[PDB]
Write a protein that binds this ligand. Structure first.
Ligand SMILES: COc1cc(C)c2c(Oc3cccc(C(F)(F)F)c3)c(OC)cc(N[C@@H](C)CCCN)c2n1
Ligand SMILES: COc1cc(C)c2c(Oc3cccc(C(F)(F)F)c3)c(OC)cc(N[C@@H](C)CCCN)c2n1
Lengths: 301, 301
């Protein structure tokens, strides 16, 4: 028995984190080969943030306006350019700790690990989901800007996310490592609103499977459902509609537990309609949606 | 806004994890300088586990019965000895990735990070508390035995825990890196029972403080309490009694929030007596006890 929300081991990312300072603005950068990647708003003052012209602000900056520190080592900036919303600082030294890495763009509902950093120094690691509305319920914002999100496959760090901002509602938003925002957000101090935040249905079903693998079975009923009937109920409680592809990725958990996917959907239907009646599942009083099927399979062999 | 259960960055521990095999038994070892530390029950078959004589089983083993693999590198064992419940394998090579480290013994209610490993390979990292009954609600047991728990202070890994076993109830138990068990447990396949598992009161108060720092204030009432009156209620709901020392360590969170410790105790008293009335705190429907005051202070600057 046991089911923890686990982050990926962070070591390969720790060796890439640097401090980037431009005047009184300090944040976190990612140092891969001879490039440091960071949020372009490092070149802005808190006043500049209302309606920045990033191209003109960037033109005004020279190499020597960027202080990059790796531990207690100052890196020399020899080039500065912009790719969408990320600043790229070419430095004179290739990161000798550079891992095997890719840049990927993840889908709403997918999970990743954040290496939370304070002013270029790794502070902590957590696992989260990209909400359906492309926001992140992140750690307390404390010198945290430019912290990155990543998955590990085999020997490769897949960098999927960089923190750029807090929205006025206190949720986090940011970009892929190509500097394209997730969701309709912009790196300027404008009242910006997120879409309505739905529960990630396939993740909730994956977690009910984790619960069953752990011998939690109280919420299994004798019913089944059709996808169509389930989705009528789901929509009423602000759950994403379940798709055939999502039923398909739950197949291995079905096979292992002896519980057909649509039977688990009929359990979830009743949990939504009736609540938990003051019981818990894997120690939780709420349905958890931050485990993908693949996360549950990873942890359960 | 934001409050995540964060683990320590795991990189310094990743470089110390090895596979230890004795016959058909494989588990995780910790390689620091020229010593590999692991659970002594690696020398036992599943049959040996009923009533092992570890001294006699160990005497029967030679160096070459221990297969230690670091990544895809075989380490030569040149010595085997026992310190309480941990096996120590002297190897011909000092771990060139050995961090600055200490061995500490933690107190019930203290938190640490576990680097969950599968057969010598880092799999994931999570933050947990040592329960008052000295058990760990750990990750799913999957090639996980010998995985270690640690804190980081400044540049130093404080190793506090090594997983030895699952109890029949599915909770985890283990030892300090000196091989002394936490709690009344023994590394043998005997029906072993834990003491009653109390809620870590000072951790719950620390988390209500985190909630307030994050602008969650619905559960603040106009009352105060005495320690004595609070502790009468606490004991009835299976909360550890609050001590003066515990009031003392909450002082910085009191100062920052403008909420006196005994005023937060009066909020907790009412939450225990009345429940949450279907509201949540920091997105939870249950009171969380896996953040120390020091964890909340770390994350909130
Ligand atoms: C780079 O993007 C960031 C990052 C943070 C943490 C921000 C913050 O909040 C913090 C709250 C507590 C602690 C911290 C600190 F630890 F980081 F200092 C920040 C703010 O509100 C106070 C306001 C922001 N907007 C810009 C105008 C900042 C300067 C221009 N690049 C912030 N911008
Ligand atoms: C070393 O202490 C361990 C570790 C685990 C995971 C154990 C386990 O459970 C597992 C469940 C699923 C997957 C796994 C595996 F991935 F590890 F294989 C183990 C068991 O029940 C099946 C039984 C145990 N007791 C001993 C008799 C094992 C051999 C003597 N050293 C286990 N002992």
């Amino acid at each position: 028995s046991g089911f923890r929300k686990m982050a990926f081991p962070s070591g390969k990312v720790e060796g890439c984190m640097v401090q980037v300072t431009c005047g009184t603005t300090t944040l976190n950068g990612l140092w891969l080969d001879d490039v440091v990647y960071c949020p372009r708003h490092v070149i802005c003052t808190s006043e500049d943030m209302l309606n920045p012209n990033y191209e003109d602000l960037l033109i005004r900056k020279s190499n020597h306006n960027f202080l990059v520190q790796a531990g207690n080592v100052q890196l020399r900036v020899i080039g500065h350019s912009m790719q969408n919303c990320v600043l790229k600082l070419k430095v004179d030294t290739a990161n000798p700790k550079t891992p095997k890495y890719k840049f990927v763009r993840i889908q709403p509902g997918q999970t990743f690990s954040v290496l939370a950093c304070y002013n270029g120094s790794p502070s902590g690691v957590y696992q989260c989901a990209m909400r359906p509305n492309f926001t992140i319920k992140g750690s307390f914002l404390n010198g945290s800007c430019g912290s990155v999100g990543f998955n590990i496959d085999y020997d490769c760090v897949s960098f999927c996310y960089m923190h750029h901002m807090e929205l006025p509602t206190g949720v986090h938003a940011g970009t892929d490592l190509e500097g394209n925002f997730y969701g309709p957000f912009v790196d300027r101090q404008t009242a910006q609103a997120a879409g309505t935040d739905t529960t990630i249905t396939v993740n909730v079903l994956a977690w009910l499977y984790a619960a069953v693998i752990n011998g939690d079975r109280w919420f299994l009923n004798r019913f089944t459902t059709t996808l169509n009937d389930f989705n009528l109920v789901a929509m009423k409680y602000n759950y994403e509609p379940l798709t055939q592809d999502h039923v398909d990725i739950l197949g291995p958990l079905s096979a292992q537990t002896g519980i057909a996917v649509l039977d688990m959907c009929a359990s979830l239907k009743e949990l939504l309609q009736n609540g938990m009646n003051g019981r818990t599942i894997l120690g939780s009083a709420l349905l958890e949606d931050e485990f993908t099927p693949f996360d549950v399979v990873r942890q359960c062999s």
